[PDB]
Design a protein around this ligand. Structure first.
Ligand SMILES: *[C@@H](N)[C@@H]1CC[C@H](C#C)N1C(=O)[C@@H](N)C1CCCC1
Lengths: 730, 730
């Protein structure tokens, strides 16, 4: 009869396993086992050593990661990893020759690389160092410098600047090898007119004078970085001191004013697909470009233009979805909202057709989460269609030649244990591995695409299961309440022997940002687990308006006015929970991180009287402080000629007064390059001028995630005690 | 039966009056009455209007202050005051012609002056603007630019750089008019090699991007600014486009390495006195310089050198005391430690004499606080001699011609009400005003120097007295405990009907920095008053080793090792207090600001088990972070060749562990240019790595004094609740 301690959480007492494989072909994959990379034969467990407990130990214990060339001939050894922003980071590398069985030592690779990657084919390498792109046709050979315009915080070649890395692409990389590795496409960013944000860094107590970090960061309405797209021919390198990359210029309907590069996708090797977006993400264009053999130039004829548009809000969930072309690149499938506002799959022809560019292959009041693979006859995707649960994830498949032949491949398997699947098909969809993140303990299995014969079970958390037997785990209800005649899903983490007649304190876990989803069928062991299993607190989340994957009617509901409906609906959800009975209305709280911290703060400052206390970590206090790409996507420009008013209305400080009726805890990281601290600093100041007492806590040199070990532990313990004090427990 | 509320303190319910006069001659003074400057006749209350309720109102309500030329012909009107550091600030000025009865409008004075002042004689003005010195022989006339080397954060002409303003001179000014206004002496500082500290400023929530303030600030051991001393001849100005100032060069025994300018003092008009100090304040030299009429140059012959030295610690209390020359400038009196280490008054002859430069005029185990005036026959000073109370202040006087004719002039007056006097003699000591800060309510009276006949009572707080009748005011014991065979004074603010048999919670109010004094006989209405009158908390302070005015044996006890004895003795004092009975050992706290916050933190982190909780505001966490002039004066240089070890031993972070046994509250101001925040940031981080929970609070854009109105209120309320929570009250 043991509970789930805060220590169980902080020390990670109960490890949850998984099976992260790396398809190397249509029939074999790689898998790390006891610091050994093994090659597995999907079909017969037939295994085999690929890299030993050994190898990795040479470069000390600093071996951050590894990357096997596609032709399985060499292996990249990452080490001396140094983080920088969400995805950026710099490591040192070593190429290990599998065949010759030793480390290539000749033409090494810069001891401070910002990015590196093999071609899709052989053993070609492209890496960015000092903001410049370099190429090595083969591992033993010398580097060919592709660019030289590179310069810190000014010119980025092959890597994204801060805002692009964070809001557009999602990674540091801005390189794209064409299939058959003939070309190498890359983007270039000029951060010149972009303003700077400059926070302090204290470092070891031995540093006598604190450093200062500057970053070209564009806040709402500020001048943004600029782009340029190039494609350099890899094959000529050996016969020149320099090659002259060819530039593609965004489509006219985008060049008139500020705009961004949305996504890159190689169709074939003489055809590439680029997606562009206007600064006001109202409009989007996806041009298809062909390589002219004669004049050695790329053409992006307006006939292959393709326009995406939204009269309700913005394009895509967080940006236009990616296209998936056929072999002959004659057509492509892409997820777009249908006549009803439901993100579905439809076909396109390379050449645009007058208001008929699409033919939907999917219909219904549910949405396609993502396209997973496109065979010559099949299109495997993932949707939240099954059991009308927008919070669930299942793997479907449609026969191209017959859109009727639609079959779910995960819906049966374990309806009880699994309702949230993650997938991963082999190079040519011959086999497919399934990741059950579903309600119960995560379950990984691999099947044979043909008949779905579950070849075997790769990982069932039997171990974690035996362990959790001696612990009083909490439960998780995932249902939905209905407001103004609409389904609105929510979830609750119920403490152990939860008795519907007694009354418990309630903690609302918030996010509620555009296209967010907190109510789902995924298994987790987090802080909320400890809060229910040991403090008997009910932790609930509610996906209200402007959220999830339930159509644009719900998502675009927030458009041009954040800090409105999503906040309100969060309060309503609490009301409703109270009406369910088992909630001690005298002890109801709410917390959130980043966007969630904003809503938390906006709820606490609404004076609805419904909440006692709350905690906001790295909150946003007013949209002018946040970056352009994100903010503007929903708020437009902060100008009288546009949406300045809603900007100035959705301020947290403008609600300082109402905080007198609440115990508030504001937490922020000192080195937060994302949500600047200026944000919380502006809040504390607002409350101080209002004469409202509250509790604060800064985390010296912590990121936007306050995730260093010691900090992570400290911030959760401190938040626990805050709730304990607030709920009269502790 | 009403108590003294936290509101009584914060809103300043009970105003304490005073009488701030401005001697205009040996017989008349100025006094502000209902926004009217009145001229009073010391002798017969004979008054008279000098400036009206009027005048001041023209320049709106922005009239920051006023300054009457010595020849009472014009008045300076300060307005548009903008603070910057402790004493620095910039205002706008207007010269008001008393005679012509209107504002001089012609040759105005720069709308952003950094400093200004009349000559000691007529109506000459010298002011610094844009770091350059300017002169106006008379108010209606045009400015004569004296310097032009001026440049922000680099070259300072006539004003002090940050460290000098803060640690050496105590004011922004670096100008000195000679008597008879012929010359104008000034110092010039080059901040060139001095490193920068750069904190952020957020300002109104409308500022989209936070500013950054940089300041050339030299931390312990860092490169210091450099000095140069000039004297320009004011009389030539009218006959040149430019004048060439003459430079005086510090004495040889100081020029070998880093050093500072200690103090400037004009002896006569052909003789000036400069005091210099080595970077290691072990040594000091006070040269006397004469103006050569022939070669038009100043000479500072080594024969008039004069050397001050300390084999126990540093020179002076916070720097060498100032000299007080005779009329004919043949001799001068200055406060220096005697053979026993007691700061006393002794005579010097312009020319130094081989190890006999001094002749003490004072002896005893008490010290002379300061010299107040030097007549042709009398020397008025202030000491803590009376009743062997080092915490008391009395005005004495000695007949020069007979050192026996020593008489105290304030010791009788009101032994009950007054034990802490402040003085102020007329231009030639014909009359003298007394300021009773003593035990009881402050009492101001003026007397006639001849026989001390108290002419009248200028201010007795009868008003405040009538008011405090209906309030249960706390008492204040000022006694001393004896440790290791030595007197050590302490004081306690006892709650109203204090009953020696019951038991109260204890709050130690700390400072305990070198030459500090918290135990004195001065009347005050502060936070501690509220804490006793309404929370029944005993607030006590203790002057232990390395403190007050009780000889160098006690003061220099800390030398080369801060964060030692002064911390310990503070704990001992608590022990002793407990042994006195009336202290609930289960509820003992301790707080402090700046230096006090350091000791508080060092005590809490000592694991002595004696304290429950504590509060540290803008603390120092390790001496390498604090500035050079201050730190080095007691710690030397942070180098292995000197005192690096004691620097690294006295760290607050090195005691993180021991904080597990304490409720700690760390508070810091965001725009603290004095104690950088880097300090608290380094502490929070230390505790977080130690896994020690604690409470924090930052004050957005607040100074080192967190003294803006809203902030001041907020920080005390928050501290109150912290103690309330800690002491189980609230
Ligand atoms: C906190 N999560 C901040 C607050 C605003 C925005 C959101 C949501 N945000 C981000 O960090 C975003 N970059 C966000 C990360 C995942 C999708 C976009």
């Amino acid at each position: 009869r043991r509970t789930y301690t805060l220590a169980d959480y902080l020390k990670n007492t109960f490890r949850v396993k998984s099976y992260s494989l790396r398809w190397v072909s249509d029939s074999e994959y790689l898998y790390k086992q006891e610091n050994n990379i093994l090659l597995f034969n999907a079909e017969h467990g037939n295994s085999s050593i690929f890299l030993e407990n050994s190898t990795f130990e040479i470069f000390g214990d600093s071996i951050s990661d590894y990357s096997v060339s596609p032709d399985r001939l060499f292996v990249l050894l990452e080490y001396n990893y140094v983080k920088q922003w969400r995805h950026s980071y710099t490591a040192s590398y070593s190429i290990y020759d599998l065949n010759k069985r030793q480390l290539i030592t000749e033409e090494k690779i810069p001891n401070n690389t910002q990015w590196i990657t093999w071609s899709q084919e052989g053993h070609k390498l492209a890496y960015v160092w000092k903001n410049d792109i370099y190429v090595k046709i083969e591992p033993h050979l010398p580097s060919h410098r592709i660019t030289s315009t590179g310069k810190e915080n000014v010119i980025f070649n092959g890597i994204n600047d801060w805002v692009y890395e964070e809001e557009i692409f999602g990674a540091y990389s801005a390189l794209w090898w064409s299939p058959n590795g003939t070309f190498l496409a890359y983007a270039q960013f000029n951060d010149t007119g972009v303003p700077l944000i400059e926070y302090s860094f204290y470092s070891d107590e031995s540093l006598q004078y604190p450093k200062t970090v500057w970053i070209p960061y564009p806040k709402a309405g500020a001048v943004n970085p600029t782009v340029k797209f190039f494609i350099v021919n890899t094959d000529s390198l050996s016969s020149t001191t320099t090659t002259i990359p060819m530039q593609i210029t965004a489509p006219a309907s985008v060049t008139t004013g500020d705009h961004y590069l949305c996504d890159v996708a190689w169709v074939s090797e003489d055809r590439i697909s680029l997606q562009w977006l206007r600064r006001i993400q109202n409009y989007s264009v996806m041009a298809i470009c062909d390589y002219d053999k004669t004049t050695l130039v790329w053409n992006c004829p307006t006939t292959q233009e393709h326009i995406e548009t939204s009269a309700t809000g913005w394009c895509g969930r967080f940006r236009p979805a990616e296209p998936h072309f056929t072999s002959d690149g004659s057509s492509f499938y892409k997820i777009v909202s249908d006549k009803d506002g439901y993100k579905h799959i439809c076909q396109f022809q390379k050449d645009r057709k007058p208001e008929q560019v699409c033919t939907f292959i999917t219909k219904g009041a549910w949405e396609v989460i993502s396209i997973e693979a496109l065979t010559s006859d099949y299109l495997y995707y993932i949707s939240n269609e099954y059991k009308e649960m927008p919070g669930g994830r299942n793997l479907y498949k449609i026969q191209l030649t017959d859109h009727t032949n639609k079959k779910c491949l995960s819906c049966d398997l374990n309806p009880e244990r699994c309702q949230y699947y993650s997938v991963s098909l082999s190079k040519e969809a011959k086999y497919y591995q399934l990741g059950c993140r579903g309600p119960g303990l995560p379950l990984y299995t691999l099947h044979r695409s043909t008949d779905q014969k579950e070849l075997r079970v790769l990982e069932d958390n039997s171990a974690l299961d035996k362990m959790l037997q001696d612990v009083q785990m909490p439960s998780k209800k995932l249902d939905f309440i209905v407001l103004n005649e609409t389904r609105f899903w929510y979830q609750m983490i119920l403490p152990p022997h939860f008795d519907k007649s007694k009354k418990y304190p309630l903690l609302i876990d918030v996010y509620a940002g555009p296209c967010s989803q907190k109510a789902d069928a995924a298994f987790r062991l987090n802080w909320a687990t400890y809060l229910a299993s040991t403090e008997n607190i009910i932790v609930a989340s509610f996906d209200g308006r402007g959220s999830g994957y339930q159509g644009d009617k719900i998502m675009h509901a927030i458009n041009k006015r954040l800090g409105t409906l999503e906040v309100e609906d969060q309060i309503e959800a609490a009301r409703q929970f109270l009406k369910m009975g088992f909630v001690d209305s005298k002890r109801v709280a709410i917390w959130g991180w980043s966007y969630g911290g904003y809503v938390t703060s906006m709820v606490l400052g609404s004076g609805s009287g419904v909440f006692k206390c709350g905690i906001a970590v790295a909150p946003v206090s007013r949209w002018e402080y946040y970056d352009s790409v994100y903010t503007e996507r929903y708020m437009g420009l902060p100008t009288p000629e546009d949406n300045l008013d809603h900007y100035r209305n959705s301020t947290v400080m403008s609600r300082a007064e109402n905080f007198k009726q609440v115990e508030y805890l504001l937490i922020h990281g000192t080195a937060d390059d994302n949500v600047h601290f200026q944000q919380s600093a502006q809040i504390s100041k607002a409350l101080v001028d209002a004469g409202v007492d509250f509790q604060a806590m800064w985390y010296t040199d912590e990121d936007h995630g306050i995730a260093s070990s010691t900090a992570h532990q400290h911030i959760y313990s401190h938040m626990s005690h805050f709730l304990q004090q607030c709920f009269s427990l502790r």
